[PDB]
Amino acid sequence: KKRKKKSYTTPKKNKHKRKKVKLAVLKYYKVDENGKISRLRRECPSDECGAGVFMASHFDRHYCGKCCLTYC
Amino acid sequence: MPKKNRIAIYELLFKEGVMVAKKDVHMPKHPELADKNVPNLHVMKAMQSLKSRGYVKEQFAWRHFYWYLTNEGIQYLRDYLHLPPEIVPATLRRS
Amino acid sequence: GVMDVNTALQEVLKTALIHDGLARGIREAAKALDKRQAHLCVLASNCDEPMYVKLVEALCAEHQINLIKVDDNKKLGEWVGLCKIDREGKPRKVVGCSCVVVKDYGKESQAKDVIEEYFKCKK
Amino acid sequence: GHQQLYWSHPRKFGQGSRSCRVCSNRHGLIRKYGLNMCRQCFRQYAKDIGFIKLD
Amino acid sequence: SLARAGKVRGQTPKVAKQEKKKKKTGRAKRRMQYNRRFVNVVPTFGKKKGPNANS
Amino acid sequence: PLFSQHTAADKHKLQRFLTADMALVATVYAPITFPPASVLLFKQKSNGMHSLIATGHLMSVDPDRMVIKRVVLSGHPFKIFTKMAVVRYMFFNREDVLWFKPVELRTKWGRRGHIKEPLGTHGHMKCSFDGKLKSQDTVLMNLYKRVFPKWTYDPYVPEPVPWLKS
RNA sequence: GCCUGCGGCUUAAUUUGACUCAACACGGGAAACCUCACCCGGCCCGGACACGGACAGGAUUGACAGAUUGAUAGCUCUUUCU
């Protein structure tokens, strides 16, 4: 047997290049004149992401990045 | 691999001189790395990483890789974990 | 007090990588020192973002973390250790970090001597 | 990857989950008495395992 | 009907000549031919190796 | 001009570039002169220096001498069975293969074949051959058209400046 | 009459070797998947290594929801978190 090549569909399905939000650590904290630190987003009730890892502010919900826990 | 997995493999080598494998892609975990939770897919290719540099020796027989520590392979693992030159591996010990 | 003032920080950072506590960068260095587990911190002086210096030092002294100062972003990453070396030992390539968080010390009477006295008279 | 469908098809029963222990082949296999070798790789090690062609 | 003229000369990749150090001439060359054959004799059991013999 | 193979046959293969050692036939509409006659070729370089590129002579003058432009289309044999193989990247439609069905294939390693069925909606084809193909191979078909030169004749040619070297 | 092998012919593919004894219940070939090479649609990287580029003010990794998608396929997109 010899090979049919067959290299054709709706041409490509290219992958996701990773999102570069520059200095997004500055987004979470907000420091006022005295040093006031109001934490804008949520701390997870889990064990591995408690007191060190923060959560997500989408438009109506919560979505943790480590343990993938979802609220609304 | 994550860096938790990289440094489990290197502990059992410098103690002994030997790391073995099954050549299983479907494997959940390797049995020597017990309660250390490294898939046996990860034991292979880090041990494939040190061949092309010249550190581990392949000599394959019946679906199970064998590996040794090179004389230049001895000094490589002492810089990573910082073991001192006060401690020997199991090579220079017996008799 | 044999090690000099900024010189005594060379012995400190070698010992933690025996036990893997130096989390480098901007993002983990805040959070892993929020974690009520680590000892101290340093911020570099060569730093370009105005929103950078605001957030870092405010979390420190509230959670009882004292700050030392070394100048460069090139300097405080060679203690983090990202920089590659040549065949003869030259620091060939530099990618330095402007933040360090130390969690576990080693046991060195050279490192612990000089830097802890710097903090008492500051109080 | 990823982990949920990388090797997900169940390699239980059937000759897709039996290999020769010598040459990792899945055809022509002898699994009697717990050999688990191929029928050609048996004939190399037939005497070294200890089988004798008596008649 | 067939018949090219110098096909094989024009199909060969034109490899440029290497630059080596010059050869000694005359008495100097003969000297080197003498010492390569009778002076630094290397012992062999039956002598089956030639001078140009590449493998 | 149109450069060509200098052959004894009726068909002459076009040469797309002028080679440093080959003897070639330049074919052009010019007012008929009688052989023998010498023929020189120059090219306007820069600042009006005529540069001698090619020397020769006048051969027979006739329009009947057909110059043929060839096109060699490469393909890839990716599935190989004995004496019949599957080629891709030579065509891209289906009826592209169906158009060039009676075109006899050849092969870089010297196999002489011809297409059978087209299979894909993309350009894939089953092809028979004389022997079995190497996988290291490249399939290729030869297409030909007759090409005649451009009508660019002006008897006026500018006076060159004195020639010098670079 | 049927069981299976070969050709032959339709088929996206109905893989392939074998052609007088010395091919044709043969390839331990009784293949639902697997085996699987064949065809269709998708995934992954399992590209070791040396050097250059980038990269710590993060290179990169993992991803609920909803659309799409056969697929609780972060595969792509929004969503912004690790």
mmCIF file of C-alpha atoms in Angstrom, chain C:
data_model
loop_
_atom_site.group_PDB
_atom_site.id
_atom_site.type_symbol
_atom_site.label_atom_id
_atom_site.label_comp_id
_atom_site.label_asym_id
_atom_site.label_seq_id
_atom_site.Cartn_x
_atom_site.Cartn_y
_atom_site.Cartn_z
ATOM 1 C CA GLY C 1 30.374 41.711 63.098
ATOM 2 C CA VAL C 2 32.991 40.451 60.650
ATOM 3 C CA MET C 3 30.643 40.497 57.662
ATOM 4 C CA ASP C 4 29.952 44.012 56.475
ATOM 5 C CA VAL C 5 26.599 45.776 56.322
ATOM 6 C CA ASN C 6 25.205 44.758 52.939
ATOM 7 C CA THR C 7 27.859 42.009 52.731
ATOM 8 C CA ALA C 8 26.168 39.920 55.457
ATOM 9 C CA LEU C 9 23.163 39.272 53.188
ATOM 10 C CA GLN C 10 25.235 36.915 51.008
ATOM 11 C CA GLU C 11 25.286 34.175 53.670
ATOM 12 C CA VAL C 12 21.526 34.450 54.387
ATOM 13 C CA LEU C 13 20.145 33.510 50.981
ATOM 14 C CA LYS C 14 22.402 30.511 50.272
ATOM 15 C CA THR C 15 21.031 28.597 53.280
ATOM 16 C CA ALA C 16 17.330 28.778 52.412
ATOM 17 C CA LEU C 17 17.827 26.998 49.071
ATOM 18 C CA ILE C 18 19.042 23.989 51.038
ATOM 19 C CA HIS C 19 15.418 23.934 52.254
ATOM 20 C CA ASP C 20 13.672 25.799 49.400
ATOM 21 C CA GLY C 21 11.944 28.895 50.811
ATOM 22 C CA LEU C 22 12.892 31.735 48.462
ATOM 23 C CA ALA C 23 9.763 32.599 46.472
ATOM 24 C CA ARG C 24 10.831 35.200 43.941
ATOM 25 C CA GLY C 25 8.915 37.808 42.049
ATOM 26 C CA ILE C 26 6.098 40.240 42.737
ATOM 27 C CA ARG C 27 3.104 37.931 43.042
ATOM 28 C CA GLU C 28 4.088 35.175 45.455
ATOM 29 C CA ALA C 29 6.289 37.439 47.627
ATOM 30 C CA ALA C 30 3.268 39.340 48.922
ATOM 31 C CA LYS C 31 1.081 36.295 49.503
ATOM 32 C CA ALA C 32 3.646 33.894 50.957
ATOM 33 C CA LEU C 33 4.534 36.559 53.517
ATOM 34 C CA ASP C 34 0.847 37.138 54.238
ATOM 35 C CA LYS C 35 1.020 33.478 55.276
ATOM 36 C CA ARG C 36 2.184 34.210 58.898
ATOM 37 C CA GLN C 37 5.126 31.816 58.441
ATOM 38 C CA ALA C 38 8.156 33.769 57.208
ATOM 39 C CA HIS C 39 10.727 35.882 59.016
ATOM 40 C CA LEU C 40 11.719 39.039 57.126
ATOM 41 C CA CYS C 41 11.923 40.760 53.737
ATOM 42 C CA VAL C 42 13.960 43.111 51.513
ATOM 43 C CA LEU C 43 12.815 45.587 48.848
ATOM 44 C CA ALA C 44 15.246 46.849 46.226
ATOM 45 C CA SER C 45 15.735 50.530 45.518
ATOM 46 C CA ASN C 46 16.103 50.321 41.745
ATOM 47 C CA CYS C 47 12.394 50.008 40.921
ATOM 48 C CA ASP C 48 10.450 51.840 38.279
ATOM 49 C CA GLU C 49 6.713 51.410 38.915
ATOM 50 C CA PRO C 50 5.167 53.861 41.388
ATOM 51 C CA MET C 51 2.379 51.396 42.171
ATOM 52 C CA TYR C 52 5.084 48.806 42.927
ATOM 53 C CA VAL C 53 6.556 50.412 46.051
ATOM 54 C CA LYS C 54 3.177 51.359 47.553
ATOM 55 C CA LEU C 55 1.753 47.865 47.996
ATOM 56 C CA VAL C 56 4.887 46.016 49.107
ATOM 57 C CA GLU C 57 6.021 47.859 52.239
ATOM 58 C CA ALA C 58 2.557 48.487 53.732
ATOM 59 C CA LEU C 59 1.735 44.824 54.356
ATOM 60 C CA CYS C 60 5.125 44.361 56.022
ATOM 61 C CA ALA C 61 5.225 46.496 59.173
ATOM 62 C CA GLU C 62 1.582 45.742 59.949
ATOM 63 C CA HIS C 63 2.385 42.049 59.893
ATOM 64 C CA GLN C 64 5.658 42.853 61.765
ATOM 65 C CA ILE C 65 8.036 42.469 58.818
ATOM 66 C CA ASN C 66 11.094 44.688 58.767
ATOM 67 C CA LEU C 67 12.750 45.912 55.588
ATOM 68 C CA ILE C 68 16.408 46.301 54.618
ATOM 69 C CA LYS C 69 17.602 48.175 51.514
ATOM 70 C CA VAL C 70 19.913 47.163 48.699
ATOM 71 C CA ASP C 71 20.002 49.256 45.509
ATOM 72 C CA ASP C 72 19.654 47.198 42.370
ATOM 73 C CA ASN C 73 17.222 44.842 40.680
ATOM 74 C CA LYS C 74 20.307 43.289 39.077
ATOM 75 C CA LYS C 75 21.815 42.813 42.519
ATOM 76 C CA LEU C 76 18.968 41.172 44.440
ATOM 77 C CA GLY C 77 18.433 38.367 41.925
ATOM 78 C CA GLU C 78 21.982 37.020 41.946
ATOM 79 C CA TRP C 79 21.128 36.174 45.550
ATOM 80 C CA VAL C 80 17.911 34.620 44.185
ATOM 81 C CA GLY C 81 20.218 32.816 41.806
ATOM 82 C CA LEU C 82 18.624 33.024 38.349
ATOM 83 C CA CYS C 83 21.846 34.178 36.699
ATOM 84 C CA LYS C 84 23.762 31.758 34.488
ATOM 85 C CA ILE C 85 27.550 31.390 34.504
ATOM 86 C CA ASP C 86 30.277 30.868 31.901
ATOM 87 C CA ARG C 87 32.933 28.149 31.781
ATOM 88 C CA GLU C 88 35.461 30.164 33.815
ATOM 89 C CA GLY C 89 32.879 31.418 36.328
ATOM 90 C CA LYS C 90 31.742 34.774 34.925
ATOM 91 C CA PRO C 91 28.119 35.838 35.667
ATOM 92 C CA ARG C 92 27.301 35.706 31.977
ATOM 93 C CA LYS C 93 23.565 36.402 31.919
ATOM 94 C CA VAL C 94 21.521 38.377 34.421
ATOM 95 C CA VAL C 95 17.797 38.153 35.096
ATOM 96 C CA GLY C 96 17.438 39.567 38.618
ATOM 97 C CA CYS C 97 14.431 39.864 40.949
ATOM 98 C CA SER C 98 13.727 42.928 43.075
ATOM 99 C CA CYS C 99 11.965 40.946 45.835
ATOM 100 C CA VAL C 100 12.992 38.171 48.269
ATOM 101 C CA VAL C 101 10.952 36.442 50.998
ATOM 102 C CA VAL C 102 12.909 34.235 53.399
ATOM 103 C CA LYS C 103 10.903 31.583 55.262
ATOM 104 C CA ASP C 104 13.372 29.079 56.788
ATOM 105 C CA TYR C 105 16.856 30.029 57.924
ATOM 106 C CA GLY C 106 19.899 27.836 58.050
ATOM 107 C CA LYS C 107 22.228 27.825 61.053
ATOM 108 C CA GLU C 108 25.080 30.274 60.437
ATOM 109 C CA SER C 109 26.641 32.398 63.172
ATOM 110 C CA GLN C 110 28.126 34.675 60.486
ATOM 111 C CA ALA C 111 24.773 35.562 58.927
ATOM 112 C CA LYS C 112 22.676 35.796 62.082
ATOM 113 C CA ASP C 113 25.204 38.036 63.878
ATOM 114 C CA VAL C 114 25.463 41.160 61.717
ATOM 115 C CA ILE C 115 21.930 41.762 60.426
ATOM 116 C CA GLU C 116 19.906 41.256 63.624
ATOM 117 C CA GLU C 117 21.717 44.087 65.435
ATOM 118 C CA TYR C 118 20.761 46.468 62.585
ATOM 119 C CA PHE C 119 17.077 46.173 63.624
ATOM 120 C CA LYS C 120 17.304 46.931 67.369
ATOM 121 C CA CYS C 121 18.686 50.486 67.126
ATOM 122 C CA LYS C 122 16.209 51.184 64.314
ATOM 123 C CA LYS C 123 13.362 50.713 66.821
#
